[PDB]
Amino acid sequence: SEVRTIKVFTTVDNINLHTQVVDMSMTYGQQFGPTYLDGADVTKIKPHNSHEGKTFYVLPNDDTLRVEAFEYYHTTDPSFLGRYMSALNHTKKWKYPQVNGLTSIKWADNNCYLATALLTLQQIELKFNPPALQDAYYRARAGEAANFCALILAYCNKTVGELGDVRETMSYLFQHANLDSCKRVLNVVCKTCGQQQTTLKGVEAVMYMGTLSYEQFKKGVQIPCTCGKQATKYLVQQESPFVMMSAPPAQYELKHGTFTCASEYTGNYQCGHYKHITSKETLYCIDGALLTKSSEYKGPITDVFYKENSYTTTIK
Ligand SMILES: Cc1ccc(NC2CNC2)cc1C(=O)N[C@H](C)c1cccc(-c2ccc(CN[C@@H]3CCOC3)s2)c1
Ligand SMILES: [Zn+2]
Numbered sequence: 496s497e498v499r500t501i502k503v504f505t506t507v508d509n510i511n512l513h514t515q516v517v518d519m520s521m522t523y524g525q526q527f528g529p530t531y532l533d534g535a536d537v538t539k540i541k542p543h544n545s546h547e548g549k550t551f552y553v554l555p556n557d558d559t560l561r562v563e564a565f566e567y568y569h570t571t572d573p574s575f576l577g578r579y580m581s582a583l584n585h586t587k588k589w590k591y592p593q594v595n596g597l598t599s600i601k602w603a604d605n606n607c608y609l610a611t612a613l614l615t616l617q618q619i620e621l622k623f624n625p626p627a628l629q630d631a632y633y634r635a636r637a638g639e640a641a642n643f644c645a646l647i648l649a650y651c652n653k654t655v656g657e658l659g660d661v662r663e664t665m666s667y668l669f670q671h672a673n674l675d676s677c678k679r680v681l682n683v684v685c686k687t688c689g690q691q692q693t694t695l696k697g698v699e700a701v702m703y704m705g706t707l708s709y710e711q712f713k714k715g716v717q718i719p720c721t722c723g724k725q726a727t728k729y730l731v732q733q734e735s736p737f738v739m740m741s742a743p744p745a746q747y748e749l750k751h752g753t754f755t756c757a758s759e760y761t762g763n764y765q766c767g768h769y770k771h772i773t774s775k776e777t778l779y780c781i782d783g784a785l786l787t788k789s790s791e792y793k794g795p796i797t798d799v800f801y802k803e804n805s806y807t808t809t810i811k
Pocket of ligand 1: 658659660661663742743744745746760761762763764765766767795797
């Protein structure tokens, strides 16, 4: 039969595009392997006339693409791009509305934990290592968080419609960002066993699991010592742009101006709902596209963020 072809662009980073000639008789999958147009899988679909000019994503099948893919995503997981494209198909459909001057996500596909995380990332200082995140992030701040959310699902290995832990999610994001300059100095004191001082750098220097109160952490928190007689851990020094204090959800009261933002989780383990509370002129509770405003907030808080620069204890 007659041979008909169009020119298109393949890519892995939608930054470097390589001109290709495709045969309409054959499916895209036969010609380039797995292929995706805006997350849409066209691997088993024959080319149309409309497809001409358009940019398709493909798996790296040569050293050039593998090098290009690694530079953009700081990863070599063969499934990665398929998952990022799979998530993207769904994420584009979501509506991201600007709520209180910050981009958020109207609820769908259990996206409540992402919206919450996304609002958090707009309020704190974070330089992502991989250009893929840097780039999607910049656009996410502008009001187009589709790719940023898609990349987050691909990076966090989550499937659309599956709920996720906001702390676990942010832990992954920090692991892929520049926190090398972050430093923490915790002193532990036992009446029996003495004082032991430890230094934490990187993610371990901004996240903490067991209290929501930054001030409590500074005053000191009781922890079980090796001996079996309880000992007190307290914060001696903190160099970081923020800190994340996390604990199992409990009834907490947030006062205006004493924090940056918290994550409220209501419901049972792994099947709850997430709401975002921010401190500005007054307290702001952001639930999807819904916004509530109040002077005082009492709810089951599980994560609190606090902007910080340099802090040193006045203890001893
Ligand atoms: C949503 C989700 C997805 C995946 C995972 N898995 C990964 C963590 N490592 C693997 C966890 C999560 C989770 O539920 N994240 C909340 C903050 C949380 C964290 C810790 C404990 C609890 C609760 C225990 C009992 C409860 C009943 N409800 C309370 C009782 C008082 O107020 C509300 S919640 C919840
Ligand atoms: Zn001890």
